[PDB]
Each structure stands twice: as C-alpha cells, then as structure tokens.
Amino acid sequence: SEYLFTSESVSEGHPDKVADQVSDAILDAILAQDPKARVAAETLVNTGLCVLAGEITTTAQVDYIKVARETIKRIGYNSSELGFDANGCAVGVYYDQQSPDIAQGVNEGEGIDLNQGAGDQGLMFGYACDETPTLMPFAIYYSHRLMQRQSELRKDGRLPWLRPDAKAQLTVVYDSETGKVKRIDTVVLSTQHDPAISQEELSKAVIEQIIKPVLPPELLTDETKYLINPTGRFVIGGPQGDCGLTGRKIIVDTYGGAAPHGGGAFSGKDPSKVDRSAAYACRYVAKNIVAAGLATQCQIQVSYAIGVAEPTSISIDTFGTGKISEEKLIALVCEHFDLRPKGIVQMLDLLRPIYGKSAAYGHFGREEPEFTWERTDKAASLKAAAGL
Amino acid sequence: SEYLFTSESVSEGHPDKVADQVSDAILDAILAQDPKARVAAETLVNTGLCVLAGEITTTAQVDYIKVARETIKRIGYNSSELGFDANGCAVGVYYDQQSPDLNQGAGDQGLMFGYACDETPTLMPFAIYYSHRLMQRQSELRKDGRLPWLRPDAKAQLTVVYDSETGKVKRIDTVVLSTQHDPAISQEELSKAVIEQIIKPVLPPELLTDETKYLINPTGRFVIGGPQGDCGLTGRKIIVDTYGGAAPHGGGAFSGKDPSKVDRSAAYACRYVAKNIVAAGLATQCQIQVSYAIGVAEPTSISIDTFGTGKISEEKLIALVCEHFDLRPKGIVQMLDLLRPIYGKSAAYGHFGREEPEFTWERTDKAASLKAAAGL
C-alpha cells in the first residue's frame, strides 16, 4: 500500500559543487561583458588545486584566476584551518578556443539550416508535479532546502561552528494508490564543523535549527529516523577531503531521480549548449502544463542533433493524469513554445549573467527572478487554448 | 498510437570516455596487485593534457603515467596532429595516496537505480543497446583499417518510435552519427560509408524504412576532435553508462571507483536484481531504487516498480529480493566477486547489456531460484 523513495542534496561547500560554482562564476563574468560568448568551462578541484579547462571564445576580458579564487572564498574556503584555502590554492588556466568545426554548425548563416544549430546532440528531460508549492518532487525539493538552511546559518554566524561541506538525504513514504506523500521515513544530515563542538551538541542544534525548521511538521512522526553525522566527526571537507569536478551532481541539480536524466551537465555552459537551454525549456514547459491544471504530473523528453535547429524528437508523458491526450499536448506545446535553440534563448532571456545562483541548491524549483524557466506565465494561455 | 524516445552513446575516443577509461585502467592495474585497495581516481583530459587526481589507499606499485599513456595509445590518439596523443601529452599525477565484516557501513550516502526489460536479447532498452553497438562498429572499422580515415572521437543518437498501446518498437525514426575524420575525405563519401558500412549492418533492417532520417556530421566538418575540441572528465557519461534515459539515475559515477563504493557496487547489484527478476519471468519491466547512509550497512530504502507488468506484487518482490540478495556494501562485493581487475572493459560502450565474462552483474544465475521461490 506504500513505497519508499529517496533523494539527496549537497551544500555549496561540497567539492563537486565548488567546481560547478567556479564554472558558472566564470560563465557569468564572461556574459556580463559578452552576451554572445561561447563558453564550455570545466573545473577540477583537489588539494590546493583548481584546474580550469575547456573551450571559450569571447571578446570578454576576464581574470579567470581572480574569479575562481573569489568564488572559492565566497563559498567559505578562506581560512587556514580548513586546509583548502583560496589564498593557498593553485589556479591553472588551460582553456582552448571553441572548435571552428563546431562553431560553423552553431553560428547562424552557416548551418545545415542556416539557423542557430544545437551546440551538440543529446537528450534532455523536464518534469513537474503537484507535490510542492513550486511544482517539484518532494524529496529533492526539501533536500535542497536542508542544505540551503545549513548554509544560511553558517554564513550569518548563527551557528558559527558550521563549516562549508555538508550533505542531506531524505527517504519519504508514498501511498501506492494515490501517489501522495504520507510521511518522512529517514533524514540523513552530515555537516562539516569546527572540532571544538561535541557530536551531541551538533545533533541537538542540527535538529532544532536545520531539520525541524525545514521539513513539514505533520510528516515527522515517532517512526522518523534521524541520522546526523552518522560516522561521527566531520572536521575536514571540501576539496581538501576529496576531488570535485564540474557536472558530477547532475541528479542533485535536477529532480533527484524522480525523473530520468539525459546525461548533460549544466554549469560552465553558455545557452547555445542545449544540455542547459533545452533542459531549462523542458522544465518551463512541464511546469506550465501542471500550473495550467492540464496534468498533475508531466514529463517531457526532447533531443537534438549538433548543428541542427529543430529538435530530433519530442515526447510528453502525463502518467494518466492528463486532462487531454498527450498528442494534443504536444500540439499545444509546439504552438506556444519555440524549442529551437535560438527560440529558447529568446523565450527565457538567457544571454545574461544569471547562472551563478543555479550552481548550488538546484536548478529547478526556486522561483527566483533570475530563473525564468520557473515562471508560470504561459499557464493561463495553455489552459484557455486547451478548452478549459 | 505512437511516441518517440531517444538515447545516445559515444565511442571509446570521446574525451569523457577517454577519462573514464584511464580511470578504470588505473583501477584495474591497482586491483591486479592489491584486490582490497581503495581507489577514487578522477581524470581530466584537454589539449595535450591528462590530469590524474583523487585518493588511493593501496600496497600496489603502479606506474600511473605509463598506464594512462598505454590507454590513450590503445584508444587511437597516436599523433600530435590530433591535439592529444599518448607519446606526447603531459600526464600529471596529483593523487592523495596513502598506504593502508559483512556489516561494514557504506562509505557514503546516496541513491542508486537498476533496470531491465524484454526489448533486447540482453534485457536492455532498445535505444541504448543499439546506440552502443553503432559506436562499437565505428571503432571496429577504424581499428582494422576498413575505414582508415576514421579518427577516434564519435557519437551516435537513435530516435525510436514505440507503439503507445503495446510498448513495442515499431521503427527507427532518426539516426544521428558524428565521427571525427581525416580532412582528405569528402562529406559525401563519408556520409555514404557511415550509413552503408556502420549504421545499416548494426540496426535491424525491418526497423529502417524510407522515412528513417540519417544525420551524419551535421555541422559539415569533424576534423578537430578529442580533448582538444572538447574537454573530458571522469563521470560525465553516466546515462550512456547505464540505460540511456530509459530509467532514472542516482547521480554517482562508476569509473575510477573501487567496488567498496556503493555508487558503483549498488548500481551493479540493482542491475543484477532487476535483470534476474525479468529473466525469471516475474515481470517484463523492472526498476529498483536503493539508498544508503554513510556508516550504515543495510540500505536506508529499497523500492521496486514493475510498471503493471509484475506477476506478483511489488511487496512480494521486495521480500524475495531481501531473501535472495545481500545488498549490504560488503555483501554485494561477495555476491558479484568484485575484488578483481574486471573494470577497464566497462568504461566504454556501456556497463550494462554486455554479457562479457568480467560482468558478473549480467549473469542470470538467480532467475530460476526466484521463479521457484515466487511460487511460479
């Protein structure tokens, strides 16, 4: 009559997320000067190490080393006690230019269709459902918020012993018949901390200040299991502790496994990379379908060929909850959304330095003004055009 | 009455796959000397560059640079004209390396998925299965000189049409294939050879129709390639490595990780569980999710979905799985004989769906016991 489902998130101090944030800070710095820049910025962080590699073609003049160090400092890695310290980190720049063989497919006036072609082949999924106020699956939505809360309390000093690296995991119970959340089964929360605080003090504060204020009280019961720093002390973390790379948190970045993923990473990529722009568009489409009341769950897949503007495929699944057929939904989507690469960029105003905030705590489910793919401004037109 | 679904794969020369293969070649070299080693070997490749970083605990003595160069050589990067070559690139070793029970706790939290279905002989989804085979065929004809103008880097993408009622594949709608090439061959000659000698020998003829669209090297040129054209990193092909989008993913990479790491061992176990449930005729579609907490042995969650195809309830299946499989981290290692150098081959053309002798998670040796224990 019920089943379990689990998602996780990590803080901005997790080493993979450090790499994502460095990649998107560099992207933002470039786009602030050159909105049309071609950016494919990959980052690897390790002990004392920040390698910047990939392909960038831009008129922007950005001090990549300074931007990387300032990003690492803003995350919290700015003191000798943490091991990994921006001031004591080697930043090495290895960027190439964008390959001209790729550029001639993407550039307008040079495509097989002379339109802006997709930056790559690939497949992308979007998803929305009615489980949370921002139309996200429950477990990833609240896992992100646990990690945001950890960072909030650290950065304003209310829990001054918190350190940057942390992880959270939620196992939730669903009703097999209704698909509705019944209760929270397990909360895992691990946080880095100053060595002077005891594990007992830490657990009390994590419960009072992080777990209880974030999760819905009605879903925490006598059966809920709390696993706080379950292997004990967590003093060293970040890239002193383990290696981080761009694009190694793609499930955290999206839907926490509540929907399939096409494989493409987001951070460090300008919007001509459909890995980013089309995944954002798919979230926008699915969210507006659910907000229009046309389905209570909606999943979309698209795909592209490098150097081709029209998607090679589109498919929509409402899991039996759609008020109209999925064929009619695809027709509505194609009428109200331009999923060609240039059409997406125009639809979502993507040639702007709006990406740094997306690189931790999830790309989806936060109704921040930067995140145009979270607007539900097409829902009314979809509902009307469906005949509802 | 119909819907579309798309998956992709990449060749062993794709820069992300180069990184995966270097990571797992180093893992194998370590495991051959020290089966109990802890390995978390990450690789980044770019123009003239192979960075090796991560954490290793072992008694093995491995020449990591030589292993990396040998792996790059085997893949086919043997000229600096390509911007990346085995003899000439810089290899830099940054590992944090140190010298150095069924209820041992997991080494991390995390979630993992497995999947199986009846669409292909090895119980894989159609689109990923044949996307892999397209890329294996590209590499085969390059290496044996049948198409000597091929270069190592390549990608393929299949869009398939499914019947909305029966769920069966009806036809192939679009084949995308991009392959790096010697500048001397025209696009017209390249396109014809890819279609006639790579694509058509691999895909089922009855699924290729006059409506099938072939998009070959659609930018018009693919001479620059490899890590120069596109930086590669370990763990950036996790959907190619698994089910091509036909099932969700927990997020963790496989390559460079020793089998104590549940990101890899539990995903392999979930494939093993799902494939045996299908092989036993208990379902035609089966998806499983597990998760772990750091320091805890038994998974924090397990769930199974047969998408209405199951012959017993999913509750009954979960009970069967707990009785017939040991999903504790050390129990998986024993179940699948994982403390051996068996991983280098997994790092290109998919971890699932090939019944190689190394791939113990592809054995259906529990199907009969599950079919009997289910009462069927």
Ligand SMILES: C[S@@+](CC[C@H](N)C(=O)[O-])C[C@H]1O[C@@H](n2cnc3c(N)ncnc32)[C@H](O)[C@@H]1O
């Ligand atoms: C298109 S690149 C990703 C974007 C790239 N980093 C950039 O700077 O725009 C990803 C993969 O596409 C393939 N690729 C590279 N050049 C290509 C070309 N000219 N045509 C088709 N595929 C290409 C290679 O497999 C490469 O690893």
Ligand SMILES: Nc1ncnc2c1ncn2[C@@H]1O[C@H](COP(=O)(O)O)[C@@H](O)[C@H]1O
């Ligand atoms: N003592 C610890 N307890 C819980 N989580 C940790 C601890 N140390 C590190 N982590 C987290 O776990 C991630 C994966 O690496 P590992 O520390 O090996 O599990 C790290 O990047 C940290 O986010």
Ligand SMILES: [Mg+2]
């Ligand atoms: Mg990681």
Ligand SMILES: [Mg+2]
């Ligand atoms: Mg991709």
Ligand SMILES: [Mg+2]
């Ligand atoms: Mg890549």
Ligand SMILES: [Mg+2]
């Ligand atoms: Mg992991």
